[PDB]
Amino acid sequence: PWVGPKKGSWVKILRPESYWFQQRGQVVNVNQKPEVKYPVTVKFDSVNYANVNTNGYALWEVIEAPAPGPGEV
Amino acid sequence: YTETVADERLFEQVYLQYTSEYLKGPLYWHPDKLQGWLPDYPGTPMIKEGKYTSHVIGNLKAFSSNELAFLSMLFFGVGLYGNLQFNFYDPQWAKVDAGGFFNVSYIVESFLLPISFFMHIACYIQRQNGK
Amino acid sequence: FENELGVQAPTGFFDPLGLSSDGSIDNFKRRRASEIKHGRVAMLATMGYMTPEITGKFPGYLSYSQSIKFADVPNGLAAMSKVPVLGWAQVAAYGAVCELSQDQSPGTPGAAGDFGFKVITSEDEETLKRKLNSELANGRLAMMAIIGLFFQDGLTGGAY
Amino acid sequence: GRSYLIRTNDAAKEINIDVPLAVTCMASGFSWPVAAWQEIVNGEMAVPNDQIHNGGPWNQS
Amino acid sequence: XXXXXXXXXXHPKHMLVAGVRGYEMEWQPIPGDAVKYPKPNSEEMFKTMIGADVETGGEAWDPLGFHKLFDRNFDFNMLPVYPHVQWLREAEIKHGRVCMLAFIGCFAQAGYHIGVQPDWSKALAECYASPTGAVGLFQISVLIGWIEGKNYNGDAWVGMSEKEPGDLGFDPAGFTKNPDFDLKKAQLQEIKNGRLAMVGCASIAANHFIPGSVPLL
Ligand SMILES: CC(=O)O[C@H]1CC(C)(C)C(=C=C/C(C)=C/C=C/C=C/C=C(C)/C=C2C=C(/C=C/[C@@]34O[C@]3(C)C[C@@H](O)CC4(C)C)C(=O)O/2)[C@](C)(O)C1
């Protein structure tokens, strides 16, 4: 039984200290081990100050938002 | 059984939900729970049900809505009369300039306009609570 | 709407133009309260035309600033342009406080005793209806009288 | 500028300008006082605050 | 098959906005103002409101989209700064009534008088500057105060007015107490006449201060 958002599905970030808070990014993969605290891996078009466009988030920090659309983060 | 991160998060949620309810009670005694701090004064609840309780208007809490409405309109009339009869009609400036004295009735009445404003506010607050 | 107070001797349910054949109970209560209030106002009004005319004419001023005196104010229609306007607005106030001190207990005007403004009712229903009908008949007559005194005042200069 | 940015949702198009599209938007900008208002009232200019980064966190504990 | 996330590991999302209570609280009890929780419905209820007629199209005529600004409030600052269509209709009919009175007032005062005399564009400023038997200003102002203190339009700003817009319950001589009488048609005629009187009053006001603007005075 798959857990978390599907691969390639857009999710809105709910981590307040994240550089992409309330932004959206494609789900690269979700780790299926229940022992992993932050299994969801999300990649973004906008890099942060460390020039990193991907990060691993918790299961409770992604809400499966729709596609961004024209001129929308 | 091993404690997965989901189980730890579940314990976090249970602990927070229980403790946030417990600390509101009479068994936590934090300085932020003193009188003059966040909680309302014991016998004088200000806001309940998202409506100004009758205790907001202080000593007027026992007044009826009709009494407050009558006082509000009467004070509005008297204070507006005083202001208009002191500023524009029957000016007192020339009379007091030549050594005279103010018409004390005008001065006393003119202070009843903001009193009337807050009186009609209190009338509405009383009407909301059904008093 | 017959069997309600108001139908006594010279006419029964009087309505020539209807206005109550609809049977709206809420409408009748408001009309009844209006009819009684007008009468009650008119009855004091008819007293207000008789007394200052013949005598009384309260000693004093009623306006110390304008130097008016009660004797100066003409009786009847001409007063409402001679009584200082501050007096009329205060009459509206004294009416209002009693409009919000004479609270209504049931459906139609009540809660003052015979005219006692805590007095109690007339108890015996025969007197309860007889006095209530007497108030209505007196009030209606005064209503017709005060407009007649208004017309008489206009027709013949002063109030009489 | 806003029209070009909306129609080129890529960083590659900001360093290497799509000149035909750029001049197309430049010529199309004359009707801005009407198109901009029609976008304002029809919910196509602004974006709800819950879709862009509000700012730094000020609380959590 | 995707496993359902337990409530322990669910998400808060951002359904909780600045216009509503947060996790658990009650909003501030404001007196008569925008109260209660707003919901987007202005444009939708605007397409059901009557007033549209064949002079301009036949559907809901609103270029500039002033109706929709309430629905946008949620996108903008998430605050109902712009009124709902219910408040807009209340303003519609209030302006219409006031104009239908005011236009014939302008006409009558230029041809009628009572026992002070001063133009029409300076009649009020004169009456507010020379009281001799002019308690009529007091009576008119207290009537206005009582009327729109009693008939203050509830919570029309956020579209939650229980009273139908413009329905003050003033139908003394049973003019349209009929079950429908096409009450839509009577209301439409009222709105058309109110708009016409608004245009007339605007024409007169703009002409008196811009000479030769509107044909005839
Ligand atoms: C379906 C239906 O019917 O619904 C209706 C039913 C209801 C509820 C009953 C109803 C009502 C009530 C109504 C109409 C009230 C009517 C009011 C009438 C007012 C009367 C007045 C002003 C009296 C006068 C007296 C005057 C005197 C004038 C003179 O002194 C003058 C100057 C000069 C003198 O030389 C000559 C003079 C001649 C002596 C004057 O000029 O005026 C309502 C609300 O309308 C709805």
Tab-separated table of C-alpha atoms in Angstrom, chain D residues 11-58:
chain	number	residue	atom	x	y	z
D	11	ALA	CA	14.843	31.202	-16.546
D	12	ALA	CA	16.326	30.352	-19.953
D	13	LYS	CA	13.894	32.798	-21.583
D	14	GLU	CA	15.034	35.661	-19.318
D	15	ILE	CA	18.725	35.527	-20.269
D	16	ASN	CA	18.109	34.622	-23.936
D	17	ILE	CA	15.116	36.841	-24.697
D	18	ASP	CA	12.564	35.429	-27.144
D	19	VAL	CA	12.678	38.605	-29.216
D	20	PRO	CA	9.567	37.906	-31.362
D	21	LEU	CA	7.510	37.190	-28.241
D	22	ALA	CA	9.125	40.128	-26.436
D	23	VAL	CA	8.170	42.621	-29.142
D	24	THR	CA	4.735	40.992	-29.409
D	25	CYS	CA	4.146	41.682	-25.709
D	26	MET	CA	5.638	45.170	-26.069
D	27	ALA	CA	3.158	46.005	-28.829
D	28	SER	CA	0.310	44.284	-26.965
D	29	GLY	CA	0.885	46.394	-23.855
D	30	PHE	CA	-1.040	49.389	-25.237
D	31	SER	CA	-4.366	48.038	-23.917
D	32	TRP	CA	-3.043	47.747	-20.355
D	33	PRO	CA	-5.562	50.115	-18.646
D	34	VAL	CA	-8.435	47.830	-19.721
D	35	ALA	CA	-6.795	44.392	-19.709
D	36	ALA	CA	-5.228	44.986	-16.291
D	37	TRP	CA	-8.555	46.007	-14.755
D	38	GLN	CA	-10.346	43.084	-16.409
D	39	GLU	CA	-7.734	40.804	-14.838
D	40	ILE	CA	-8.088	42.515	-11.446
D	41	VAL	CA	-11.851	42.034	-11.255
D	42	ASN	CA	-11.797	38.519	-12.774
D	43	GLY	CA	-9.200	37.159	-10.337
D	44	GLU	CA	-6.284	36.836	-12.753
D	45	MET	CA	-3.825	39.469	-11.450
D	46	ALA	CA	-3.559	38.877	-7.704
D	47	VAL	CA	-2.824	35.563	-5.994
D	48	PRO	CA	-4.049	34.473	-2.533
D	49	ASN	CA	-1.446	34.858	0.199
D	50	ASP	CA	-1.614	31.090	0.844
D	51	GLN	CA	0.070	30.403	-2.527
D	52	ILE	CA	3.254	32.508	-2.189
D	53	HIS	CA	5.915	32.509	0.509
D	54	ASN	CA	4.533	34.773	3.232
D	55	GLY	CA	7.902	35.345	4.876
D	56	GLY	CA	10.054	34.107	7.702
D	57	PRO	CA	8.445	32.142	10.516
D	58	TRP	CA	7.814	34.169	13.640
